[model samples]
Target: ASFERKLITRDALAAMRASLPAPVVFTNGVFDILHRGHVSYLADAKALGACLIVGVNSDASVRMLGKGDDRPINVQEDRMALLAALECVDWVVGFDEKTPVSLIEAVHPDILVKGGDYDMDALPESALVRGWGGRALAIPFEHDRSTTALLKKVRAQS
Candidate 1:
């Protein structure tokens, strides 16, 4: 399917989830800056399930995280589009909340994944998934490949 077709709303994603095969994997992030780490992490997450649904943070939602005033260099639509372009990503959705709990509940995926930086036990979403007989995992990220670090490097060059 075309990458643009993969960008869907929460309701659309929920509907799509119903028709997809088992072991659906869900993950969410700002994804403001696309990098090798982000794509590699996504591929790893895809390996854990038949379908991978990515939730991107909205511009306003990202601001709530206090990443920075200039953070989220890319808009929600752009971020979603970028993720949707990936072959490993089956669907991309946008969320306006600080956390993806609501999105997760709606999707009810078989597996929930996050980057290694996050503690699986500390994530409320992880517990929620486990409550419904689903599994949650924290996949390791590529070392020194974070958006924050990348931005810092760009600043130094300027």
Candidate 2:
């Protein structure tokens, strides 16, 4: 089956939770521009569990993130498609909220993964997952890689 088929709705993901393999890993991000860092990070996340479910921030949510006035160079659908196309990603879902709290609650993954930059205590999702016997992990960041920095470099070359 095509990897694009893996992009399922939250309701569908919820329904499939009982049947999916244990230690399902989840991560969320804007992913406006697909980059090597993103791919490497996702692959690392997949290694932590039987499956990886990526939560993509909706266009509105991206704007709310204050990334920039014209951030998320790609639309939500395109971003989702790009992420869903990756073999390491088992599923992709778009979340409209500023945060993926609702999406995380619905998926109820066995493990919630985030970039090393995030403080576990500062993230409410960490506590929520831990409350239900799930773990929230902070993976190390890849050096010299980030959408923001990439964009800055591109602009400088322009």
Candidate 3:
């Protein structure tokens, strides 16, 4: 699919918000390096709703997230391109916030998803989604498939 068709700007995303189908799944992440775990997670997310929108953290925002100074193995554009290529992703948007709360409010998705290990009560967005009668799901994380762990292993081998 053309990137123009699959990628939506924040403005476009806002317009699409009210008209989107039920269970409009939304997830956010840095996704610095492409990997099988990401593919699987996205595929699973797609299965949850009529459409899936992926909010990618901008490079600057990612730096603020504190993954590390040398994080984001891939650039923001490259990450967006790779995500746009996935069959499960209906739209891709980038945000320069440490968290995707503003974008989430703008999109107002029906289903908000996160990876495993999140505490439901402690998550503000998830709680907000529940307040709006939307469901928040935490999918299981793929074991031993993290970018940080992969990078560390490679460094150790080298």
Candidate 4:
């Protein structure tokens, strides 16, 4: 199958959920610029379970989260496509909310992962994951990079 099939819609989630193998891993992010920080974390997330499903925040949701006025350098479609193209990622779905709680409920993964910077317990989505006896984890940061810093580097070189 092609990478495009990895891009799933919320409507397809019910069927997709049943198709995944045990110990499914779920993670959500904006991934505006697809930096090392995002890549490393997602690969580690995949290591935790048989399948790694990514929930991408839509352009409206990204703006709602207050990333910045000129944020999400890549559109939501492009961001999801970038993630779907990764080998570590099994499925990619876009969410149009500040938090991915709704999507998380739909997938009901066995493991939920987020960046170490996020307090897994404090996040409502993680809490929901734990409520269903799923493991919620905070994976340590790697690669020491971010789109924030990447953008500055590009601007400086300009």
Q: Pick the candidate with the highest lDDT.
A: 2
Clashing residue pairs in candidate 3 (N, C-alpha, C atoms within 3 angstroms): none
All candidates: TM-score: 0.88, 0.89, 0.87, 0.87
Greater lDDT among 2 and 3 belongs to 2
Against the reference, the lDDT scores of all candidates come to: 0.84, 0.87, 0.83, 0.83
Backbone collisions counted per model: 0, 0, 0, 0
lDDT of 1 by residue, 26-110 (tens): 9998876577888899999999989989988888888888664545666788878888999899888898888899999999999
Candidate 1 lowest-lDDT run of ten:
66-75
Can you write out model 3's per-residue Cα lDDT over 1-158, one digit (the tens) per residue? 47647777988888878777778999998876666788998999989999999999998888787554456667787888889999889889999988998998888888999877777667788888888999997988674535767785476446
lDDT of 1 at 24: 93
The lDDT of model 4 is: 0.83
Q: How far is candidate 1 from the true structure (C-alpha RMSD, Å)?
A: 2.8
TM-score: model 3 vs. ground truth? 0.87
Model 1: lDDT equals: 0.84
